[PDB]
Design a protein around this motif. Sequence first.
Motif, PDB file in Angstrom:
ATOM      1  N   UNK A   1      51.194 -11.692  44.645  1.00 23.72           N
ATOM      2  CA  UNK A   1      51.869 -12.488  43.643  1.00 23.72           C
ATOM      3  C   UNK A   1      51.660 -12.059  42.214  1.00 23.72           C
ATOM      4  N   UNK A   2      52.010 -12.945  41.273  1.00 19.76           N
ATOM      5  CA  UNK A   2      51.957 -12.665  39.835  1.00 19.76           C
ATOM      6  C   UNK A   2      50.532 -12.439  39.342  1.00 19.76           C
TER       7      UNK A   2
ATOM      8  N   UNK B   1      46.042 -21.375  28.872  1.00 19.51           N
ATOM      9  CA  UNK B   1      46.945 -20.875  29.903  1.00 19.51           C
ATOM     10  C   UNK B   1      46.153 -20.521  31.152  1.00 19.51           C
ATOM     11  N   UNK B   2      46.595 -21.005  32.310  1.00 17.22           N
ATOM     12  CA  UNK B   2      45.993 -20.570  33.565  1.00 17.22           C
ATOM     13  C   UNK B   2      47.011 -19.778  34.383  1.00 17.22           C
TER      14      UNK B   2
ATOM     15  N   UNK C   1      53.160 -26.693  31.706  1.00 16.08           N
ATOM     16  CA  UNK C   1      54.489 -26.110  31.630  1.00 16.08           C
ATOM     17  C   UNK C   1      54.423 -24.659  32.076  1.00 16.08           C
ATOM     18  N   UNK C   2      55.339 -24.248  32.946  1.00 17.27           N
ATOM     19  CA  UNK C   2      55.381 -22.855  33.384  1.00 17.27           C
ATOM     20  C   UNK C   2      56.009 -22.009  32.294  1.00 17.27           C
ATOM     21  N   UNK C   3      55.322 -20.947  31.892  1.00 14.64           N
ATOM     22  CA  UNK C   3      55.797 -20.140  30.782  1.00 14.64           C
ATOM     23  C   UNK C   3      56.143 -18.730  31.222  1.00 14.64           C
TER      24      UNK C   3
ATOM     25  N   UNK D   1      51.838 -16.728  38.459  1.00 12.93           N
ATOM     26  CA  UNK D   1      52.490 -17.783  37.710  1.00 12.93           C
ATOM     27  C   UNK D   1      51.580 -18.238  36.583  1.00 12.93           C
ATOM     28  N   UNK D   2      52.091 -18.169  35.359  1.00 15.22           N
ATOM     29  CA  UNK D   2      51.306 -18.520  34.178  1.00 15.22           C
ATOM     30  C   UNK D   2      51.728 -19.880  33.625  1.00 15.22           C
ATOM     31  N   UNK D   3      50.807 -20.838  33.673  1.00  8.86           N
ATOM     32  CA  UNK D   3      51.062 -22.183  33.164  1.00  8.86           C
ATOM     33  C   UNK D   3      50.432 -22.372  31.790  1.00  8.86           C
TER      34      UNK D   3
END
Lengths: 112, 112, 112, 112, 112, 112, 112, 112, 112, 112, 112, 112
Positions: free
Chosen positions: E88-89, F42-43, F81-83, F88-90
Amino acid sequence: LKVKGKTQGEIKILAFKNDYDMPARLQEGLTPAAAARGTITLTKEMDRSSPQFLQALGKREMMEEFEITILFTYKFEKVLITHMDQYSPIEEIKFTYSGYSLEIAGAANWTN
Amino acid sequence: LKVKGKTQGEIKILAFKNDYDMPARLQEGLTPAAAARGTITLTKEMDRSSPQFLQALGKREMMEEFEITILFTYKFEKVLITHMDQYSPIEEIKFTYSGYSLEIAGAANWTN
Amino acid sequence: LKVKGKTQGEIKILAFKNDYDMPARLQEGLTPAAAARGTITLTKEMDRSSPQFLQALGKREMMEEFEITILFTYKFEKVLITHMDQYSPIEEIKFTYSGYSLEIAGAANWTN
Amino acid sequence: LKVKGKTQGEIKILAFKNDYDMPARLQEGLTPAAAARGTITLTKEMDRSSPQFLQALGKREMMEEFEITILFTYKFEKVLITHMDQYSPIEEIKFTYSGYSLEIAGAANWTN
Amino acid sequence: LKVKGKTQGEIKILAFKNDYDMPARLQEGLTPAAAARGTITLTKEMDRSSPQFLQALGKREMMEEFEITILFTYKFEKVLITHMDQYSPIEEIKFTYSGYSLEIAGAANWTN
Amino acid sequence: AGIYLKVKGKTQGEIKGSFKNDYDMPARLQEGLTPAAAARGTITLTKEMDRSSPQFLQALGKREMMEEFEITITYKFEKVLITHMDQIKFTYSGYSLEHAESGIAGAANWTN
Amino acid sequence: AGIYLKVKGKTQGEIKGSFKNDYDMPARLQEGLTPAAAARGTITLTKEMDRSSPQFLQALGKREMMEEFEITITYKFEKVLITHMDQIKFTYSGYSLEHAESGIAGAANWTN
Amino acid sequence: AGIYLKVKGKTQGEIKGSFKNDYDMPARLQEGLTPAAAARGTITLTKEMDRSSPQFLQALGKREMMEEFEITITYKFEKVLITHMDQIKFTYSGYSLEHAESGIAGAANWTN
Amino acid sequence: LKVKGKTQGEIKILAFKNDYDMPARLQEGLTPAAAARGTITLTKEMDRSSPQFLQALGKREMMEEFEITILFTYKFEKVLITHMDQYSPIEEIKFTYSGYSLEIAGAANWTN
Amino acid sequence: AGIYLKVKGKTQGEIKGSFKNDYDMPARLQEGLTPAAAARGTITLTKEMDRSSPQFLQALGKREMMEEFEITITYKFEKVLITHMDQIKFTYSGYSLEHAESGIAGAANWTN
Amino acid sequence: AGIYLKVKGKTQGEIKGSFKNDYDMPARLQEGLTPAAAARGTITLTKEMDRSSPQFLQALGKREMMEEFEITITYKFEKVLITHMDQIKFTYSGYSLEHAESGIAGAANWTN
Amino acid sequence: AGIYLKVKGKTQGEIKGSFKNDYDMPARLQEGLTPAAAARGTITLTKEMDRSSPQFLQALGKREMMEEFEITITYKFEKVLITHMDQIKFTYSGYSLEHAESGIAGAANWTN
């Protein structure tokens, strides 16, 4: 580089990376020279000596004079070309040697 | 670096990376010193000691004093030059040692 | 790090990378502990414990207490220093262990 | 990750890299499963399951359920923790498996 | 990719890196095909064929048709999935083949 | 585990339970600026792909906020919020981490 | 498979069926800006070269839009424009991903 | 050891005792600028995670200053503020390092 | 590249990296040519010769003429394609040779 | 082959026949801007060095345009200008690629 | 050796004797600008840590200039100021290097 | 060879005979700008260190131009100025490269 082949005679752009290695544990009955490996790698462009070095490399031609001024400083004996990479957007000539002198002046395994 | 050769006597720019290794499993009947490997790698420019270190490296000349202040701190015994890379746009001298002292002061395999 | 040597007693900057490995295929008659390898690598600057850890590393001195709080969290038994890199512009001390505890609290190959 | 140990029971952050390998030449008399190697590596932070996974890793504890939803998608059998790196400015848990199912749904070496 | 399994039938995002190797020295009595290794690695996202390729990989299922248009261009015989990384990312599916055709049209070790 | 993830419309069913946590605070706080506005949390979560993938990818484009965001290992995050998503970076505001063992929790910009 | 690809003039025949998906959304939305204008979606496809290569390369220079863009693995993309090709990076507006199994689809800025 | 760490509210109990030190000074000092304002000191600590993690992470978001900051190896730091944590980078003003052996200490912008 | 196969006849984008190696220690009774390895790697796009080179590579077809002008400069004998990587957002063809000529003109292991 | 290369004065004789193709188009076209002016096409050729080297290097400094530029593998390029050479990166306007087999050609900003 | 290092207050006693030399000169000299102001000389020294470490670190924060700076290998430097230390990068004005053998010295912006 | 190097005051005696050639030309020529002013030619030479080192290093700081600059391999360069040396990067105006065999020379912005 002032360079002259055994065969091709005199050969006519700032190398150079000098690498020398010696194992901490010397084999019983082995000469320090045989345990060591001296290699100098010269990078330069490509021109009239390129085919001359490339012929020496394939024919195992000995360099008769190998003197790097850096009348000079580095002088190397029993010089044999061991590797070469020619490429584009330079070549890299890797020499192997036995005796050497850097100029205090240091010298090892030299021969008269 | 205050350095003196067995042969060349006293030799006249901030190294330095100290590496020391010890296997978790010690061979039966093996001394810790023989299992271990101590190596300090000094980087510096190139000048009057360069030919002196390069001669020591090829002749397996023992360093009589090897003291790195960092009157000092690091002091090393049975020092042997094991590797060297001289190059351009510096050299890197890699020493191998047995006994050592860092200054609380620590010391192992030292000799009077 | 709260650390105490077998010999040097108590030794006086946030490590740390914990690595643990276990082969999927366990050798016939082999204990899981013997097949596994536990290693924690601590990075920190250089000061009064530096010579103390460096002496422990060369003398194969056992850590009597190895407790990493992160009163703590990581506690390690049979701690042996196996590697160290001291250098400049820090050191990196690599420990090998048998028993371990992280705090739910987990623990394996621990000893009373 | 919904995870439950053989011993620790149920264990309570998005892994994950699934790696599976199969040699083109299959050994005479060898089952495809034995020739293959299935490994999924999960990265996540560190918390209540960290000591639980770290204990499983050292004790060779079998995962009783290993289900990754990505009610799920990835489900793995005979799960054994084979490697783990805990560190700082995260851990990385590397699992080894036999049977697997991804959900069209695919499945190999599965067991009722 | 137009792909169909031996078993799963027809399987329903632009790969692809084609690697082919041949030793300069051919073993006495060895066929060029056996000395060579053909591998094409396809990268794509993850969806309905992902479990289908992942099942093929574990079950050693032969691809009945493997045609890459780039009605096509690359066509491959005796296709076997040898490796896969899902993460994944994306996944990366590495195929091994014998016969091949690229379209002047070239072809080797092909079979009617 | 992975994540328990509920969304503020709509809906929440990405299969449960399904990482690199980064937080930055400028050393000098802008005059009259609240730390929360100056900081950035950011996580980044890594995982394979399924039923949540289109749900995450729809959320990212629709600027859909999360309503539950807890990744247990326990982390809990507010205004998630997904950025960014490379398949996947939240990005978040309030946060809480709670360790085990102990019951110690740190929390900032949390909301009643 | 790869891609089924039709073009808005002209034409569509690149041989069927023929990747890294990136999507970004700034955490702070410009006042009065629609998410679609603030976001950026690009999918980068890797493949060898044939009948579609000149067709892709002509499209890229002529600012030729696609009319069908579906890469099944299913992804579907709207307003697809080629923005970069090192011999392929597409830029899109609307998007849909749909998983298998399940029939779950996420979609944003899609158009009737 | 690691760090002895007390905080200016609140509190101090992260388990004791729990790195890359960077300091920069522009070569040209802005006219009328004090060296302290021109310089930047940051020490980056690496460690695993526990009872201090939420305490460090709460401090970072709340712009909570430290009141004792000493990492012994001895380093002591004033006006310590956490500026970045990837799960730790501190920013400081005054500083003191003291070596062993010797009792030599360097110190700048220290405060009574 | 002016190239012609043994079989395919004449084959119709600037390579090229020439690598040549020779061991310093020549095996007793070994010819310099057998100890050496000459390899030239050409990078270029993909077109009408791509299937022709790819067929040569699989069929071990000898290049009848291999002349690289850089009427030319590099000319190579006993040319055999030993490796090839075809890929996307180019191919890389790696040739192995015996005799060679660069144009002073150098030549080794050449044949009339 | 390599390149057939003729020059618009002067002359053309670099020995025949003698790469990374990059093309970029911004996703948003400047208002009133033609795609050709917005786009950037550059092909980077790698090769060794000879009779064309001084000819390429003279062309690069003299802003000498090419008049034939075709690198067959077929690529053809218009308004070719050398923009960079590390001893070759060309910049072009019109372009054509044509595949084999098929006779499919893509072309943009070509000129009568 | 390393460095002989005296400081302009205070004092000089870092244990004697205790590197990458960088010098830059813009090709175009600003109108009315002296070369010295346009150029930038920095020598970066690597070493372990002791009695000089706090002395170097105090000097760096206090903008303490050196008064003797000679690193013999001989280099001599004027207006030496420490600008960066990751636990050392010095900035200088005048400089002298002198080789051995020979007695050749180059020097610029030196001061009486 | 290396370089034959004479200097415009003073003097020339760096031991004879003692590289990466970079040349750039913007694709769009500034209106009214001569290509020479728009272009940038720099050749970077690597070598060890001696009698020329202080001579090169003095030249670099004194903005001393060369008067002969020829690195034969033949390259010849005008208005040669040393712009950077990490212990050598020269900047030039006019240039000539001449190949062997052939007698072909390219030259631009050369001066009578």
